[model samples]
Target: KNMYDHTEITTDSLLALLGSEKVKIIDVRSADAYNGWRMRGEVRGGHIKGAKSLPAKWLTDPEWLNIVRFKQIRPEDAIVLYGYTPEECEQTATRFKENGYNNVSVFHRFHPDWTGNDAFPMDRLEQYNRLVPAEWVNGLISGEEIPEYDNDTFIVCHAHYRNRDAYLSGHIPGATDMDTLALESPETWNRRTPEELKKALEEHGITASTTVVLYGKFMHPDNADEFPGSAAGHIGAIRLAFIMMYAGVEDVRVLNGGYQSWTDAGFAISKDDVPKTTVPEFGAPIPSRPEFAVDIDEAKEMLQSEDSDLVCVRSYPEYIGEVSGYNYIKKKGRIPGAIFAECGSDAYHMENYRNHDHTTREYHEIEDIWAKSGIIPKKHLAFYCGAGWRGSEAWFNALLMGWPRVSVYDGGWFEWSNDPENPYETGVP
Candidate 1:
């Protein structure tokens, strides 16, 4: 088939191919646009229902073929592509045909045109409320009222793994200190048992009904060499949020910028510690979402499966075996067949999703980062790093982005590399 010899399908034809086993409908637009965030002049911000998101910008990669291969696109499948512009749709369709996919076509209209029509189905992003802006935290600190959840809200600040007492010096007003190490073991860096977790929650006054707001301070430890430069309490906060979500907390929000965000906004800090309010009974049951947390064995199975993508959420150096992410694990390698979805710019900074001030980036920016990195929302993505902090942060982001099948490999490399018998490979695949 020639590059320009592309079939253009109408709305009726696209609708007819919806559930066909042979057809794969792809939205070749920005992830933000696909996830319902509109740009200027767009009528709406969502893709056509049942469309797989594979942004057009990502197609420029030399490894575009390998990236799409991970998306399970086969040569024989009937491929349908659509984007912001007719020309982009045609270009993507041409690329597919050039790659030997004979049964390819472009959806005859732009996403806005399709979404504008009342006859077509549309869905927006989900779980976006998981992120609470700095203003929200400010409101809470100022003793302002927010509906049902805010009255019983408890603010907790997490410290770096290497420095637990940093929180004692200063923190958000009326907020309590939470050491990340208290939630996990020193040896493996994995979460503690449920019984222990329950006790910790009780001690921190976090019950099933209590609204939990978490944030972290940027900690440059006295012994900086012990932890990565990217080490911050917000990383700890995210890890805690995951555990709490798993334990069935209905309302959990993380402060976008952590302590830095609060201070940057000129909010006053409290040197005096707040007393913990322990609850008599915790109502939530265990493992509210079983898929959110996966064991090492489960991660290994995911790595081997065609149905799911096990993502290695580490720096490029760590993913390519240039350096071990953690000192405990002597192995300088990644899980075999794992996708290299970087958690941050490097091992030392989460600049991909964070601003210069360490505040979380806007939703659209986060979406674009993941989409460009080949971390599409369609797949069941399980993310992991040296331990759980970085991986959990990425997992939290995935949840915020409304990726339904996301999971955190809590054990991460720390657990996987402990056993020499476990499979690992050096350098990129």
Candidate 2:
């Protein structure tokens, strides 16, 4: 049950078939390697360009066949497998044949040979290192030198939405509380004025030089009674990170699993309610990266532009107009030209984007889902939700992937639906 049962592809033959449809290149390495986690000291990161990720470890996944079919790899398609080791590729190719794939093949030289010779070509998720894991956060907070964190000072933000008690209750030690309302306005549920944001950053002891580490606490599943996105604070954490990045912060990092990760790591918690050490200056202008903020006017234009996408990250119920998805807003439909993205079951959870343990889902899976919906990396993507929480989170994923042109539609359904002239559609596109 190995490549002996299938054709072993040569290095030259494998290189020629890349980027062609119907001839699928399945990388059988770990998902981390697929997402640019360099393996075996390879010089390049990411998979061979246009290659689909189906790690060998995923072979035992209960939904293995579903994942295979989901990639649109038909049973009759030419399946070529490559990975860190020849044995791994052979095993994966064998499984493909066992699963009814007619033309399965294996490539054993993807590591030292292909990676050693970059002229062949390889690409990875851009800036994949920004999505910091719990272990990394621990090292940073524990005062150990951390990679990619070149700042003298760091801030651990326990991001919440109108729920100070969530922080007062218990949080990562020395972690300060940041109400989503501080950076965003309560009236419009959008980012505040540039002047106001500048003051808010200083008030929170933030500067462009400070390394910002953000994570959210997982609270109850209560709906908009308290706060719409408060149920899943990690989503809000990402929203906060987006605003920080948009504000021109030099170094920004998100704790992959949020509060859940810190707790899971058996780290100490604090109820000290760390006070804000306001700095005299923030050292950067507000909206330093104006590219990250997509306004209503620009959104209208994106609707008509061939190279732009208004990504709607919300529940099916919200997308199909079954519900408004927010208690504060009265809108019952989605943006007319927007393509819906998988956020989760409802506004209270981000199931599809989040792993079972609360860490962000594997980047490859997220990317695949976006590509199938035509919400691809090549386009200028602006993510939007009922308010902006879910939308910002999705946008952050795109940014972490090193997606070049992406922004949060600051005025989401709340602002779009506020205007009757703005076209809205219901019952799906």
Candidate 3:
């Protein structure tokens, strides 16, 4: 029983099947890359002829079987998953197989490694070349549509402390807390290992087709680096989705408008702890974990481009030294070409960055605060806090409130504050 026995696939074998109709090349890259240049310096382009856009994120979901039922892909479809990294693709493969898909396999290597070694005939496209669209923020519900849920669902997640505290103080009525940390450990992080994560999820009683919703503390609001680390924030969401897909949980989505959005929308809430439920009578499932990850090279390219798809979601005061948080990360400015969403510009602050928490304005008030930031709904969004925590609160709130395009820039202050070459701004406009 060699573990490596299950791994072996090459681009040439794939190319050989290109002439045949059944073989489809799947690009698990983010939408940004899928739309733009995926495999650079190639002989052909525009995705493998019949290759479907089954993102790596989709593989992490256990419920993808049901979601993609609309797409009509069967359990036995000969499928291959490819991502930026071999480890990432492996996670996808693990989940896919757990779902009872036997014919599926992962490419031993992906576009970057293949193209770097010039191992195969590839294609490059001038198409939108980022994982996320320049215009699409990470969490905006596509088209502002409220998806219909067939059964009663509970989103057991949180917003940053402030948002959660504020939410508990007031929420839509029946919602309860799973205290994300209880289910997700903060130490081992992305390195928690798949099996360990699978067991942890099971302990929480989540399984394939469980109809889950994850409302987290932060989201990508207005930046290109939606996933900045090995795992944190939405990247963690992807990790959870990936493991759940393997352990067999499905029907999961990040609660749009997150914790705050739900509370602000006047949804219900409860003080009771949500008891861990049982895994539904299903197996590992696939989910939609789509994203647009940008590394240093891509970040720099966008910074220098005229039609740069990159964005910044900080405020006028915090952008410069005019205002500061507990982190004391004074930048005295913001990244150039980055637009400002001014997350909490209108939050009715209390000297420190903390919201008064006693403010009465209600959901309408928070909605008005966002309106003041010049962020209309449905626009691509990416945001950052001084480091990553604070900004997350704002990002979570916007998504919870139905601000379509939203993603939290995890690097936030750490990346921007330290970068001398990055752009900066201060004062109103």
Candidate 4:
């Protein structure tokens, strides 16, 4: 009883603080669950709208305070907690009190109480199901029945740049190794020719009707090695997904948090060089969905229009001309008039967009960060970075959030800077 001397806030009282700046509602549920995974037998997916996601499990890690501060929750603010269970809510409340958060209370009945009610404001990523959880994938491979999956055929892919070693070391039991070169070209660092994509997909036993799931491993990057990105393939996995969607694979999915999620879940891993069977046809026209990606011609038009945004998803140094953010690319500067949506410290890492375990950051938090910089879903937005890798990842995030008219500028800064005629600016906006 009352181990932390906490009080329970009534449903009515909690509902009244919907958008209160003086209070912060924290959802102590799994990040994936909060992002609408619906793994548990719950009434629905997603979390209470406007709630900051700080799972209770993080309470013992000591680094929870870092997330707390990042969320702007302070001790003085009235803090309310809710979770899958009452015990977790109380446990989180206790942690808050232990950390000097004086005004902490728990909303003990989030399930059935909040989720069960349709009138209660709830929000989630638009395509939450496309980002499947490790458990769901495990169920698929294990031949165990699972919900939200009814595909007639499915294939799991272990993605790497040019490194088979990454996939060979240890991968999801049934995953076949897919080199980034399969769908993208090294010369341009962009999606391959339409015919090339069809051939690759067909060889990998993928058809427009077959469900495809992709994931990448995080390896230590040694700059001396040319294929440095082979170190981590999580972002690489998203790139492959984007290209597949562009090439008209009807059902493309990513393993949320990538191979790391599988390892973290203590699931079985395989070192076998998984073999794949080729499909007779890819079952779709190459480049069937041309709208998902744009070339530089449209990129320039975005600069001239008020309703479109050229979102540069690069690092601060790369955006401000301190560096090009890639060793192979020489010219250092940003496209003038492009909106800044900083990725992270450098090109290889998506630290700003991903969590410690490599899962995507909270959708609400992503929106908040963008809102401050006037990046909203209201416009026709195109995400671009040094090459198209990070840009593809960012574009996928926007699409998952259900933003309309979202596409990756395939040319990105690589092609943009290669042409000296293009206009660019550097140093602070």
* Runs in model 4 lying further than 4 Å from the true structure: 1-5, 60-62, 222-225
Give lDDT tens digits, candidate 1, residues 306-366: 7787777788888888888654567898888777767665554665555445555445556
Model 2, 1-429: lDDT tens per residue? Answer: 343576779998887888677798888775556767564557776788778777675666677787678668898788888888777776677677777887888788888888888598887767767777666777788898655566689898889888888889889888899999899999998888889889998999999889898989888566746565666778888888999999888888888778876776688888996888888898977788999999999999998999998998989999899998877767798888788886889887888886555666667779877989898889999999877888888888888788889989989889998988878788856
The stretch of ten residues in a row with the least summed lDDT in candidate 1 is 221-230
Of candidates 2 and 1, the better by TM-score: 2
Per-prediction backbone clash count: 2, 0, 70, 1
**Candidate topping lDDT:** 4
Question: Local distance difference test, per candidate?
Answer: 0.72, 0.82, 0.43, 0.86
- Model 3: runs farther than 4 Å from truth? 1-147, 151-203, 214-270, 274-297, 328-332, 346-382, 387-408, 418-429
Please, what are the lDDT tens digits per residue for candidate 3 over residues 237-314? 332433343344545544322343444434445554345464533344222222222333454555565543344444
Q: Against the hidden true structure, what lDDT does model 1 obtain?
A: 0.72
* Order of quality (lDDT): 4, 2, 1, 3
Which one wins by lDDT: 2 or 4? 4
Candidate numbers, best TM-score first, in rank order: 4, 2, 1, 3
Q: What TM-score number comes out for model 3?
A: 0.38
Q: Who is ahead in TM-score, 1 or 4?
A: 4
Model 4 lDDT tens row, 242-271? 999999988888998899889878999899
- Best-performing candidate as measured by TM-score: 4
